Amino acid sequence: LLLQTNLINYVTSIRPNIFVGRAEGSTQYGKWYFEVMVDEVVPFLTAQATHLRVGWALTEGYSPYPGGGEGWGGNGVGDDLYSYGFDGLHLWTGHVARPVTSPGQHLLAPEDVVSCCLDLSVPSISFRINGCPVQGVFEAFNLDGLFFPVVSFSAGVKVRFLLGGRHGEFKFLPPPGYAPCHEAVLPRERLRLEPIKEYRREGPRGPHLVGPSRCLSHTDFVPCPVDTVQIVLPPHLERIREKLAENIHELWALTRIEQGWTYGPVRDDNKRLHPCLVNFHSLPEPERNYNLQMSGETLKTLLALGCHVGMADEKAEDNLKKTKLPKTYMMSNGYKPAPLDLSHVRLTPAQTTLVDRLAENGHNVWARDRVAQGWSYSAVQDIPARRNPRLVPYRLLDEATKRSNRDSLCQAVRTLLGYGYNIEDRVRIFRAEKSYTVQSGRWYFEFEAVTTGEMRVGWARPELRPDVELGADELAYVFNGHRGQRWHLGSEPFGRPWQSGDVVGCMIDLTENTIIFTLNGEVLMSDSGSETAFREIEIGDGFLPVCSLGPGQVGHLNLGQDVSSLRFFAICGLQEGFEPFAINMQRPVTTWFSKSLPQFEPVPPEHPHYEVARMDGTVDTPPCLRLAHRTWGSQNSLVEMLFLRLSLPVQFHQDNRDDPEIILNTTTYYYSVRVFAGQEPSCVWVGWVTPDYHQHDMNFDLSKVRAVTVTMGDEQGNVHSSLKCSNCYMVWGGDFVSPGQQGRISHTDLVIGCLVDLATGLMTFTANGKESNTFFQVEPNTKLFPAVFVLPTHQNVIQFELGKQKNIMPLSAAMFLSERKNPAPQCPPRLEVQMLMPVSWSRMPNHFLQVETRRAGERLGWAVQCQDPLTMMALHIPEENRC
Amino acid sequence: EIFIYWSKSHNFKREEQNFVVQNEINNMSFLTYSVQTSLIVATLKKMLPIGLNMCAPTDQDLIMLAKTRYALKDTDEEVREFLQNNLHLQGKVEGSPSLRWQMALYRGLPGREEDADDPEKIVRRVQEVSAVLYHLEQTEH
Amino acid sequence: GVEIETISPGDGRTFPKKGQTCVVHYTGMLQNGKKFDSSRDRNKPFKFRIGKQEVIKGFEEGAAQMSLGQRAKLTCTPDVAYGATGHPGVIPPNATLIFDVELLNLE
Ligand SMILES: O=C1CN(/N=C\c2ccc(-c3ccc([N+](=O)[O-])cc3)o2)C(=O)N1
DSSP: OEEEEEEEEEEEEEEEEEEEEEESSSSSSSSEEEEEEEEEEEETTTSOOOOOOOOOOOOOOOOOOOOOOSSOOOOOOSSSEEEEEOOEEEETTEEEEEBBTTTTTTOOOEEEEEEEEEETTEEEEEEEEEEEEEEEEEEOOOOOEEEEEEEEEEESSEEEOOOSSSSSSSOOOTTTTOOOOOOOOTTTOOOEEEOSOOOOETTTTTTEEOOOOOOOOTSSOOOOOOOOOOOOHHHHHHHHHTTTTHHHHHHHOOOOOOOOOOOOSSSSSSEEEESSSGGGGGGGGHHHHHHHHHHHHHHHHHHHHOOOOOOOOOHHHHOBBBBBOTTSSSOOOOOOOOOOOTTTTOHHHHHHHHHHHHHHHHHHHHHHHHHHOOOOOOOSBTTTTTTTOOOOOOTTTOHHHHHHHHHHHHHHHHHHHEEEEOOOOEEEEEEGGGGGOOOEEEEEEEEEESSSSOOOOEEOOOOOOOOSSOOOSTTOOOOOOOOEEESSOOOOOOOOOOSSOOOOEEEEEEETEEEEEESSBOOOOOOOSOOSSSSOOOSSBBBEEEEEEEEEEEEEEBBOOOTTTTTTTTTTTTTTOOOEEESSSSSSSOOEEEEOOOOOEEEOOOSSEEEHHHHEESSSSSSSSEETTTTTSSSSSOOHHHHHHOOEEOOOOOOOOOOOOTTTTOEEEEEEEEEOHHHHHHHEEEEETTTOOOOSSOOOOOGGSOOEEEEEEEEEEEEEEEEESSSEEEGGGGGSTTTBTTTBOOOSEEEEEEEEEETTTEEEEEEETTEEEEEEEESSOOOOEEEEOOOOOEEEEEEEEOOOOOOOOSSSTTSOSTTTTTOSSOOOTTTEEEESSSSSEEEEOSSTTTTTOOOOTTTTEEEEEEOOOOOEEEEEBTTTTOO | HHHHHTTOOOOOOOOHHHHHHHHHHSSSOOOOOOOOOOOHHHHHHHHHHHHHHHHHHGGGHHHHHHHHTTTTOOOHHHHHHHHHTTTTTTTOOTTTTTTTTHHHHHHHHSSSOOOGGGGGHHHHHHHHHHHHHHHHHHHHO | OOOOOSSBBSSSSSSOOOOOOEEEEEEETTTSOEEESSSSSTSSOOEEEEOOOOOOOHHHHHHHHSSSEEEEEEEEEEETTTGGGOOOSSSSSSOOEEEEEEEEOOO
């Protein structure tokens, strides 16, 4: 009942830039393997404990912000269920730790080597400490995103990443078929140790602020070309099918003999006898057909894309010959390339624009057949393993490799042209604490622009909203610099854009209500003559400095506190009279940023669209909570996520007349949900949620739910416990409609009832009095919130019913201790409807881990260490397991 | 000086307005009824920070005193004499919190601080800026 | 009873004997995750004797089977700990206790 408080630690995470995933193909070793070696660990450097876990994580949901979080704060690999870790004797997933059996279980003591293995064929993660296997694995976790190694630590540990050799030497032999994590390096980028989803980075002259990162999806490695299935290949194009083939064949043969290739039986550069030096009609059968289909696809790309070609000339083609070649092209057996004349024609700039698209398509088609055969990308080239470092489809390939594909495509296009035939996470908003609102005087703060992009700086009202971009409402006066604009309610241009480094001096003046923005020493001018950005501003509650860095953008806010540090203060602003926003402050101004973590908040009483009404229970109906869409006519309509503001914990196991001897001793509890007629049941989900549900999806379904399975067994198989962990237990409303009724709009309301047994953890659902065949099992000490996910298609959408059944102890008996044995439905004012909000404000810690987790690429692996302690005073809310 | 010569005479303003309307000079393209677009006024507005820089923030206390003295159609000589008669009213560096960083900025980055002691130069550098600030007020009003 | 586990190994041959002062650093918590009392926040160890209990009896069983620095997780059941009388403002009547104990005794 009372808000708790305690002293907790600061926990961070460090990951390498290695991402793996499961998709249609092109990124599939199926298995990966890496190790973490512990050098030294102080167990009790501080009062609470020392935190150190290793494991894997997901790139779409794992985002531990420093400070509070789920439970008692200090979130690392483990909590939030998007990561799977192992401390030294526990398998951390979801939020609860499950002990595991090991030969000599102990915490991560110094000189300990823990090896984690990831398998994507069957989704499973396994760990091995000091060679001995750990009798516990994860299973059946959804592969929506990419997987990367991660280690979580807090103030006192020192570990090393032994990835794959040449980036950290191994200590134990990996299981067969497992890559040593040193592939998938994405040769456009190098290897690094970086934090996960940071919003503040130390810089040369202060803390830089960082916007959302540009993360990679798991559907990026799969190559998809344009559709060329329906290509007629008319006779004029069909005739030039082989005619083009040997031209590229001989040109590639001479490009191969550039390094000195010769005709022979076995391909080895040291042996120098790769068979590649015959004519097209004399090529070996295996690759012949592949060459024909590639040469044809070269034409099918043009045909499918458009650019209707035509036979401009034929007489010139009949007289074209083969250019002379020196004796260097001659090789011992006797082969000689026959390159067609190429200088007789020149491609127009349109052809130079369109040639690279054909190379883009060709590389995708080339990769497609390779992944169809069973080839996957690998940093280390291995021909017997059916790999080479070129399966990245187009967009993440090194520019050194990119030139060969477009060279070959350009030669093919110029061969066609020579033979006649002419050819035709949204925004990270930074702010200041609301106690710094200014209602008098003149102020001046700067904002360096390290990178050029969508970044906005200005003055905003203290009641600024985080889910709306700056300038869309009357609560902000910012200056966009990507193109040059002033944003109060529109996008009127206000000068010139920035460059790589451009301090913007924003000054407000509340004496005559003006706002002026300056570039590096120059006052910005609007279109005609204004010399000021905004005038006659109605001063109300106050103004605060603001910043709106976009995705992949870095800025630097200098409010003040150091007049000498202000680069362009003396030039413009000082003489007119402008006190910097922080002058007589011995402590830096605390900033507040919009944290993109969806949390549940009560429905506002003045919501534009949704409305919740409480109705008392009559003699026939129980107390109810109705939801109505008050603007169903011509307004917004989108999915929404709701649950009731109170939970119910599961106890530890270690006519219509109700008779007392069963109702007063039962442990079942009931609540029902009624779907009004007209709202499609296929868009309604009814069930329960754990206090760690943070999915604000727009295409939600039962297949996008988070799930995992932890299996415990002895030292060979014989599993004992198989617990299924999730954060959403509901049943789709589209499974309770008869096939005959499906196909139109019905007129009978659908009622779904959910029963929870707090003594055995059994979960059942009934629809219209009919028991369903789906059930769930939960664990002791589990908090569940009655949740309904609905997509509105009506102005009468959904209605919660705190009903009752035959001695089933209505729901208002477990959430309240006073009414423990009261068999009467109730709805106290504390029990309300809470909706899911996309983003919310948050506080930036005054002092982060100032040691910055000192890491370096040492010879014996990548070492990361933390040394200084850090503590904060948490505030735990009991009903919702937050901190 | 040219600005105050223009201000303390009606014929100068009349002739400038007549010249502008007769030649139809834009008077806005140079700076990239139409008093706010006047050439002299814009030039003085651009050059005013030069004059403000040479004045110490301590002279801000005597700025209003000089303005009040000039409010009675006073001359430069009598204003300078009156200022020198009570040149001890400036200062209050320790009496206010907003003056500490101003003095620090004045002392730190620039070069020589006017030899740090020149009673004769103080009134000379205060009178001109006070007259300019006074004459600038009527243009906006 | 007690369900003593292992977190950090000790010596295995220096078990406490009768009439000896045991020095421990312990952190207590109920069987729901809410910590109720700890000794490290007070920056002082806890001293108690065998045969002069002055402590809950389950804590005594847990500290009995330790060896010079063995970190353990003791689980104390009702009728082994404070029991039905509970503690005003402190552990509720029917609840079990989990202690993270470290026997750093120097004799
Ligand atoms: O990936 C391989 C495969 N291979 N050897 C097998 C062959 C046979 C013909 C080609 C071949 C390569 C490139 C182009 N081109 O540039 O249009 C056209 C044909 O490869 C080899 O040495 N690298």
